[PDB]
């Protein structure tokens, strides 16, 4: 029990883009109560071996931080879709079009332009004018929020228990609201 | 993420659009407005505004004393504003039945 | 009316036609934003309330 | 009580700002960038039970 704990699974909030609280993997447990010590040792050997991988994986993959479940991710931790600039070839030599049409020719259809060699292209940026910050998206949520192995659970001092496992915990206030 | 992608919370159009388009929109609001085609979120303030202690929005008081003379009537109320509350006196009125 | 006015009772009502009744999902019933504070205050995290 | 209606033709009309071809090309270039996606919400946003 206390020393080969079941990991806490992180639930997700796809609206906000944040963890939604956590509770243990109740949904994946080997029923050993009709085995003996010769095989319970092997089942514990598997459950121990799982927790080693979760600890290794959290250190490899998670962004090291002062809080589980922070309410707002800085624009340097959020992954951003920053494509290259987009270039377009402008379809008319506009200054020569006013010249030619003021001369009384009519221009219709279309690029090409037989009467002028001038082309121009301009290269706008495509990127969001400000970097995004706030919630994390689902492919980053899985890169964060590896399950939590929690040894000797609830043994420290209250007020540095894992309060943000609790779903309805207001980490901006360290408090808990009802329905109003 | 989906509240940010759908513009239910997060950045305004003048923040999330490319800077080329924002200067274009500004330069043409007269005479070809793009300013109804992009969602800006609006978001209520979640902290420091409303309490979540149990507490009445409206109080009714009854006269602690009253006088009923030939030409006028008096009533005395102990208007009690409790701790951590404030009363804009514009919200008060005397409710008379007769 | 008059000095022969009969004994009487009073009847009270209102009408409110093109309206709809509203009840905002807000920690007090003011509109402080389109995304109300209860709509983002711990009815989010699993929640699932009936 | 005898009412009826008969559609003899439906035709679709569309009006354009007669915009300069380099400007309209530039505006399209900007509006095809993924961060410049347009968005709308139904004015009565509700589920009509």
């Amino acid at each position: 029990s206390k020393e080969i704990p079941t990991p806490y699974m992180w639930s997700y909030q796809p609206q906000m883009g944040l963890a939604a609280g956590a509770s243990q993997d109740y949904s994946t447990r080997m029923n050993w109560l009709s085995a003996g010590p010769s095989m319970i040792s092997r089942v514990n050997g598997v459950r121990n071996h799982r927790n080693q991988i979760l600890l290794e994986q959290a250190a490899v993959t998670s962004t090291p931080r002062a809080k589980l479940n922070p309410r707002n991710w800085p624009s340097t931790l959020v992954y951003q879709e920053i494509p290259g600039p987009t270039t377009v070839l402008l379809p008319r030599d506009a200054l020569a079009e006013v010249r030619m049409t003021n001369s009384g020719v009519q221009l219709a259809g279309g690029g090409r332009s037989s009467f002028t060699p001038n082309q121009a292209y301009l290269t706008l940026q495509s990127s969001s004018s400000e970097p995004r910050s706030g919630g994390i998206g689902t492919l980053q949520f899985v890169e964060e929020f590896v399950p939590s192995v929690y040894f000797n659970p609830f043994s420290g001092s209250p007020g540095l228990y894992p309060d943000e496992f609790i779903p309805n915990f207001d980490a901006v206030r360290e408090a808990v609201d009802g329905y109003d | 993420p989906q509240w940010a992608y759908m513009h239910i919370a997060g950045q305004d159009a003048s923040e999330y659009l490319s800077p080329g388009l924002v200067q274009f929109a500004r330069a043409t609001d007269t005479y070809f407005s793009l300013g109804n085609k992009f969602r800006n979120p609006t978001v209520a303030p979640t902290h420091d505004v409303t309490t979540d202690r149990s507490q009445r929005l409206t109080l009714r008081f009854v006269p602690v004393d009253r006088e009923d003379t030939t030409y006028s009537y008096k009533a005395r109320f102990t208007l009690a504003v409790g701790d951590n509350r404030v009363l804009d006196m514009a919200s008060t009125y005397f409710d008379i039945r007769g | 009316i008059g000095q022969t006015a009969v004994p009487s009772v009073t009847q009270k009502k209102f009408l409110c036609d093109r309206v709809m009744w509203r009840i905002p999902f807000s920690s007090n019933f003011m509109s402080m934003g389109a995304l109300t504070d209860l709509g983002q205050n711990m009815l989010y995290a699993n929640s699932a309330h009936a | 009580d005898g009412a009826s209606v008969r559609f003899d033709s439906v035709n679709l009309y569309a009006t354009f700002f007669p915009m300069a071809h380099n400007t309209a090309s530039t505006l399209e270039a900007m509006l095809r960038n993924d961060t410049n996606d347009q968005s709308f919400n139904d004015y009565l946003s509700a589920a009509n039970m």
């Binding site: 301009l122 290269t123 | 274009f24 500004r26 330069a27 007269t30 300013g35 109804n36 609006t42 | - | 946003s45």
Partner: peptide, 27 residues
């Protein structure tokens, strides 16, 4: 009896707006 938000912003000389900075590579 329901809500939407429209996102306009502004700026012109007593003239009219042509658009701004050209990021052009020319020929």
């Amino acid at each position: 009896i329901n809500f939407a938000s429209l996102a306009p912003r502004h700026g012109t000389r007593p003239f009219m707006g042509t658009w701004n900075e050209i990021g052009t590579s020319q020929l």
